[PDB]
């Protein structure tokens, strides 16, 4: 399946900051690579073939990861949906996405639960 690289995650964040606003820059050099590398390793190791579970893992990992000074939630959401789109899943905006992403970010909504919602919306 087609994954999102750390540098792509960063570029997506930076483009989002430019378009919508927010504080620039990364919290800690290396964290993007650490987190996204972890996601991809886990997907291989756990043999996760379900696109919605994988999208959810990107979403939760970035939302909780504090890779950036700002727009972590935006980057989390857009990257998850970019992931779905690259893998042939049509995506569209839904008024449920904001609260979903916040819930993921605060640790209130698990990967499994995020995947369940994405699957309802887009599957």
């Amino acid at each position: 399946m087609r994954h999102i690289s750390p540098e792509e995650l960063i570029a997506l964040h930076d483009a989002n900051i430019s378009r919508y606003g927010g504080l620039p820059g990364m919290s800690d050099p290396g964290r993007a690579e650490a987190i996204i590398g972890r996601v991809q390793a886990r997907v291989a190791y756990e043999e996760i073939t379900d696109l919605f579970e994988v999208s959810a893992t990107y979403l939760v990992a970035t939302a909780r990861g504090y890779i950036f000074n700002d727009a972590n939630k935006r980057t989390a959401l857009n990257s998850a949906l970019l992931f779905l789109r690259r893998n042939g899943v049509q995506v569209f905006d839904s008024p449920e996405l904001a609260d979903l992403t916040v819930g993921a970010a605060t640790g209130e909504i698990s990967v499994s639960s995020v995947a369940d919602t994405l699957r309802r919306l887009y599957g």
Partner: peptide
Amino acid sequence: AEFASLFDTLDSTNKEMV
């Protein structure tokens, strides 16, 4: 353009979350 199209699609939610 990869990103611009994605942001266009999710423009509402992106704005909401700022």
